[PDB]
């Protein structure tokens, strides 16, 4: 269950890597790494007492992202909402918040990857 951060960053399936902190309602902010594949976003949380290692804190399907939000006052603090979508709307089942340096680049990349899940044009 413990993983090597560098090994995971270097995996061929990983399209994007964003160092960040995961923000909790408790003022806790955990050094972390977002890894985005063609189908999922992973959050690796650093183990401060074990150099180079992390736990897989979260794994979410990109097709299950239902909202990505931020405030103008704090552009780097991104909220991801995950859950179910249908004709009637969205059902939120999980919420994760991250403080991402250069969050603009991250959110652009993640949105691009989400669109590629939907898109099987010019097959």
From Swiss-Prot:
<comment type="subunit">
    <text>Directly interacts with GOLGA1 and GOLGA4. Interacts with FAM91A1, C17ORF75 and WDR11; the interaction recruits TBC1D23 to AP-1-derived vesicles. Directly interacts with WASHC1 and WASHC2A/FAM21A. Interacts with FKBP15.</text>
</comment>
<protein>
    <recommendedName>
        <fullName>TBC1 domain family member 23</fullName>
    </recommendedName>
</protein>
<feature type="region of interest" description="May mediate the interaction with FKBP15 and WASHC2; required for endosome to Golgi trafficking">
    <location>
        <begin position="1"/>
        <end position="123"/>
    </location>
</feature>
<comment type="function">
    <text>Putative Rab GTPase-activating protein which plays a role in vesicular trafficking. Involved in endosome-to-Golgi trafficking. Acts as a bridging protein by binding simultaneously to golgins, including GOLGA1 and GOLGA4, located at the trans-Golgi, and to the WASH complex, located on endosome-derived vesicles. Together with WDR11 complex facilitates the golgin-mediated capture of vesicles generated using AP-1. Plays a role in brain development, including in cortical neuron positioning.</text>
</comment>
<feature type="region of interest" description="May mediate the interaction with WASHC1">
    <location>
        <begin position="1"/>
        <end position="123"/>
    </location>
</feature>
């Amino acid at each position: 269950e413990v993983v090597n951060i560098q090994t995971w960053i270097n995996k061929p399936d990983v399209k994007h890597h964003f160092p960040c902190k995961e923000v909790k309602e408790s003022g806790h902010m955990f050094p972390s790494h977002l890894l985005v594949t063609a189908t999922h976003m992973y959050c690796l949380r650093e183990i401060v007492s074990r150099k180079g290692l992390a736990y897989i804190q979260s794994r979410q399907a990109l097709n299950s992202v239902v909202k990505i939000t931020s405030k103008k006052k704090h552009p780097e603090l991104i909220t991801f909402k995950y859950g179910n979508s249908s004709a009637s709307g969205i059902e939120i089942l999980a919420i994760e918040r991250y403080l991402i340096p250069n969050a603009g680049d991250a959110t652009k990349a993640i949105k691009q990857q989400i669109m590629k899940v939907l898109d099987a044009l010019e097959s």
